[PDB]
Symmetry: D2
Subunit: 298 residues, 4 copies
C-alpha cells in the first residue's frame, strides 16, 4: 500500500460525452479532459460507472481510454476502470490500459450473477496479472453491484498482491473507519460525493466522484480545510456540494452533469445512452444558472 501513495487525492469519475446519434463525441471528450486538468483535479477515473461503461462495447471503452491518455498522460493521474462481469473482457481492457500508459487499473466487483468470495479474488488476481505492473484499485459499490462483502472479505481483497487502493462507494462510515484502522497506508477513496467531508473524517484520504467534473475544486477545498482544522469551511463546502447534488438527483445525475458541462462550453450534446432518457426541459434554467455560478466561482 505504501508504495502506491502517489494515487492519493481527488479524482473525477469522467463522463463519456455522446453525439446526437449516441456515438462517442471525441471533441467533447477531449474538452472535458482539458477542463478537468485546468480545474486542478488530481486525476481522472476513466470508464467507470459515471463513464457509462456498462452501455459501451470493449472497443468503445478502449477508444475512450486511448483518447484520455493522449490528452492527459503525464499531466494528471490516470486510473482506467476496466471492470466487466467477464474476467476475460476485464483482462482485455487491463492490457489496453497498460498499452496506453495509465497509472492504475480498477474493477467493480463483477455483478448480475452471484459469485463466491474466492471467485471475486481470482477475478482481481487475473486482472492484476493482465495490467502487468499497474496497481489495482478495488471498486466496491454494493448499492448497484449487489455484492455484499464482509469487512474481513474487503480486508483480504485490498491486500492481494498488486492492490494499491480501494474506491469505497458506501455510506457506511463505521466500515470506512474500520478499513482505515486495519490499513493505515491504504489509499482509500470516498465514493459518495454527498458525504465526502464526513468520509474523510472517518478515514478516507481522497475521493473519486461524478460531480468533481463540475466542481472538483470544492472537494479539494474540503481536504485543505480539514487538514488545516477549518471545520466551518469544510462544512460550508459540503453544504454547497449537497445543494448541487439534490438537484442532480432530481434531474438524473450523469445527464444533469453533462447538461451543466454543456452550458460551460465543454459538452456539445448532453445525452446519456439509451435506456437513459433526456433531462426534463423544466430543469434547464436551473442547470444553466448552476453552470453560470460555477464558472464565476471557478
Amino acid at each position: 500500500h505504501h508504495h502506491a501513495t502517489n494515487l492519493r487525492g481527488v479524482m473525477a469519475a469522467l463522463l463519456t460525452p455522446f453525439d446526437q446519434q449516441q456515438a462517442l463525441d471525441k471533441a467533447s471528450l477531449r474538452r472535458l479532459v482539458q477542463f478537468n486538468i485546468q480545474q486542478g483535479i488530481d486525476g481522472l477515473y476513466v470508464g467507470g460507472s459515471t463513464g457509462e461503461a456498462f452501455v459501451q462495447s470493449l472497443s468503445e471503452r478502449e477508444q475512450v481510454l486511448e483518447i484520455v491518455a493522449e490528452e492527459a498522460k503525464g499531466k494528471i493521474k490516470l486510473i482506467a476502470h476496466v471492470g466487466c462481469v467477464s474476467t476475460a473482457e476485464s483482462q482485455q481492457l487491463a492490457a489496453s490500459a497498460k498499452r496506453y500508459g495509465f497509472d492504475a487499473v480498477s474493477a467493480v466487483t463483477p455483478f448480475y450473477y452471484p459469485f463466491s468470495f474466492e471467485e471475486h479474488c481470482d477475478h482481481y488476481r487475473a486482472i492484476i496479472d493482465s495490467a502487468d505492473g499497474l496497481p489495482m484499485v478495488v471498486y466496491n459499490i454494493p448499492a448497484l453491484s449487489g455484492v455484499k462483502l464482509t469487512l474481513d472479505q474487503i480486508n483480504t481483497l485490498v491486500t492481494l498482491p498488486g492492490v494499491g487502493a480501494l474506491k469505497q462507494t458506501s455510506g457506511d462510515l463505521y466500515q470506512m473507519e474500520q478499513i482505515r484502522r486495519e490499513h493505515p497506508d491504504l489509499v482509500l477513496y470516498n465514493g459518495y460525493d454527498n458525504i465526502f467531508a464526513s468520509g474523510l473524517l472517518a478515514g478516507a484520504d481522497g475521493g473519486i466522484g461524478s460531480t468533481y467534473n463540475i466542481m472538483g475544486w470544492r472537494y479539494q477545498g474540503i481536504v485543505k480545510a480539514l487538514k488545516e482544522g477549518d471545520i466551518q469551511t469544510a462544512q460550508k463546502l459540503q453544504t454547497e456540494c449537497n445543494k448541487v447534488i439534490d438537484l442532480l438527483i432530481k434531474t438524473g445525475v450523469f445527464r444533469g452533469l453533462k447538461t451543466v458541462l454543456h452550458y460551460m462550453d465543454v459538452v456539445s450534446v448532453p445525452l446519456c445512452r439509451k435506456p437513459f432518457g433526456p433531462v426534463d426541459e423544466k430543469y434547464l434554467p436551473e442547470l444553466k444558472a448552476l453552470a453560470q455560478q460555477l464558472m464565476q466561482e471557478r
Copy 2:
C-alpha cells in the same frame, strides 16, 4: 396476447457450452440442441441468464443464436433473449434473431443503472421495433436485475404493442395469480423451477428454466398431471425436481447442469466462464449418479 398463444409451453433455458480455452464449444452446442429436441422440449430460450449471456460479446451471442436456429428452426419454438443494459445493443441482437428465423425475442429489464419506468417502457418498444414482427417476451427477474416494478407497471409493460408473454422469475405467487387475473390470455412462464407446480396452480401456463436441459419432461409431466387433476403425481414430480435443485444450488446451477450433461455425453467440457470457477470435485459422485438416473428415465 391471444395471437401469441403458440408460445405456450415448457422451454429450456439453453446453456452455452465452452471449450477448455473458454471459447464457444460449437460441437457441444449443436449436440445440446439436438439432445433437447430429442427429449421432447417444446422450445429453447437462447442467450438468457442460464446461457451466460452477460459474460459474452454481442458477436458471441449472435453466433450461438445462428447455430441454434440452424439446428432447431421449425422443429421446436425458438425464443432469442436479446437483452442487454444498452437499448442499441439489444436492438442489434433483436435484428439478428429476426434474420436467423427465431419465433420470438425476449429482454431482461435492463440492470445496474437505475432507470425510470418510462425508460424501461421505451427500451422494450425500441427492441420490439427492431424485432420486426417477432413477439416480445418481457423477462422479469428482480433478484438479479435489481428492478422492482409494481404490479401496475408489469401490467403496462405486458400490454405494450408486440408483447406476447411474460417470463416471471419471481417467487411471489400472489403476484403470479394477479397477473393471470388481469391478463386471462397472456402466455405466462414460471421462471423458478423449484416452484413450478405451485406457479402453474397460481396461473402460469408453462415455464422457462435452466434445469429443463436435463429433465424438462418432468415439468411437462407436471403440466399434464395438473391438467388431469392428478395432484399426487404433480407433487411427486415437483419433489424429485427439487431434490435435484437442492444439489445444483450447492454445486452452482449452470456448472452443475453442464457437469450432468457432460456425464450424459452431451457437453464435452462442463466449464462456465470466468469469474465462475469449476465445480468442486466433492459433488461429482452425485452429479454422475444423477446423469445415470436421468439417462435411464429418459
Copy 3:
C-alpha cells in the same frame, strides 16, 4: 411431530374486537368465536398478529384466551399465541393457556432486537416448559419480525422437544416444499392466505389466516378440491379469495375484516387499536357489498 397430528387443518387467526373506547369488546369476541365455529373452521389461533397481540397487555391477552376457551374448548382446536419479545412474558401467557385448556401454544420469533439462533432456541425451550405439555407451534413471519432464519435453523427449531407444528408466514414455496421434505410428519400451516392453494401444493397441510374470519369455508373448500383432484375448483376459490384480499390490502386488512364482520352483524365496533386508524369512508360501500355477497354465499 406424529404425536401432534391432530393439530392439522385450517384455523382462523382470530381478530380481537374492541369498542370505541378501545376497550375489549367481550360480547363481540364471543359472537366472532361462534361465527367461526359455524363456518366449519377446524380451530382458532388466538392473540396472534391478526389478533392485535402487540397492542394489548398481558392481562388483556389472558382475558381473551380465557373467553375463547369458555366458548370453544372441546368443539374446535384452540391454539394460544403467547409470543412476546420477552421470554418471561411469553411464559406467563403459556402458563395461562395451559390453565384455560388450550390444545397448543404458539410464539412468533421474538422481534425488534436481534437475537442469536441459540437465543431463539432457548426462548422456545422456555415457553415449552411453561406450556406444561401443550405442544408448540413455531411461528415464522420474516416480513414483520426481522428474523431471517436459515433453513437449517428452521429445521433445528421445529425439531425441539415439544414442537408440534410450524406456522410459516412466508411466500417462499421452495422453502415450504423443503420443510415438508425434511419433516414428513410435521404440521405445516400456510400463513399467507393469498397463496393458500399453492402453499398446500408445495407441502403445507393446512393454514392459519386472518381472512378465514370472513370466508374460512372457501379455504376448507380448497383443501377438499385439491384432495379430490378438482384443480379448477381450487383455482377458482383461490381467485375469489384473492379478489377479496386485493380489497382488504387497499382498506387495511384487519380493520377491513372487522368492518365486514360489522356489516355481518358479528362485531359491534370495527376498530383496530391506535395507531391503526379507521377505514377510509370511501371504502365502506365496497366492504358492505362484500359482507352482503359473503352472507348470500353462506
Copy 4:
C-alpha cells in the same frame, strides 16, 4: 425548534439494570445514574432501545423513570422514551414522565405492524398531547423499526407542533446533512455511536448513545475538538470509541456495556432480560481489561 435549544447535547441512553431473577435492580439503577452524572453527561435518555424498553411492562418502565427523576432531576437533562407500538400505552408513559418532571419525551416510530404516514403522525400528536407541555424527540431507527420514512415525511414529522428534536439512528449522513439544512434550529442527535464524529460534521449537534454509559467523556471530547477545529483529536477519539464498539459488537452491546459497568463496581449483575443470553465466558477477560483501562483513563 428554537425553543427546545436547551435539549442540545450528549445524552447517554441509559441501561436498565436487572438481577438474576430478571427483576429490576433499583440500587444499581441509582448507581448508574450517579455514575453518568459524574462523567459530565449532559443528560439521560431513559427507557429507550438501550434501556430494554420492549422487554419491560409499562409499570416497570414507569418505576425506572420515577427513580431516575429522583436521582437526577434538575442536575442533568432528562428525556423519557415513552414509545410503545400502542399509542395508548405510549400516552400513559408520557403522562407519567410529565408527573415525574422530565424535560422531554421521545417515542420510536411504532413498529411490527405497518402503519401509514398519517398514522405515524397521529401517534406522535396523541403522545405530545399526553406529554402536556414536554417537548417531543422523534426517534428514527429504521434498521430495527422497519419504518422507512421519506425525507419529506421526516420533515413533516419533525415540524409537528410540540416536536423539539430528532434522534436520528441512521448511518445515512447525506440525509443527516439534508435534515440540518432544512431545519437549521432543530436539535439533531446522532444515534450510531460508531460514526459520531462524522455525524456531527454532517450536521448533528449532539448524540444519544448506548456506549456513552462507559465512555461518555470521549464523546464530549469529540464535540469540543470539532468545535475548536482540532480534527486530529476528534478522529483519534472516534477511533478509540470504535475499538471499543468492535469488542461490544462481538460480545453483544447492551450486555457487554453492563459487564464493563459491573467491573467498574456500578452494576451488581450484568444481565439483560431473556431472550438475551449472558456474555460468553471467553470474552470476560477482554471486558474486564476494558473496564480497567477506562477507569485508569478517567
